[PDB]
Amino acid sequence: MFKYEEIVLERGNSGLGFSIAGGIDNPHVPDDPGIFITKIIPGGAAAMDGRLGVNDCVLRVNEVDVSEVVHSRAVEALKEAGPVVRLVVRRRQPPPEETSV
């Protein structure tokens, strides 16, 4: 399935230091409405924190669910989330060594 992670960033003078694509009206890939990271800015908060990666999917911004929203609503959430932004993200979970069935 997926690996989930909570990542907390402090906003800087140039924001959070990443770009997003995706949204119900802006799919990154077919039939996926998710918000995905497309760019991490050198010297920005995301880069300096080290945890976020390109093509991570952002599911939540503080208390705002962004799993299935229009692009502008995700941008809005990220803009208005305040000085400390808690991101719930997911990415690929590598196959396990074994699975109990």
Ligand code: NA
């Ligand atoms: Na929406």
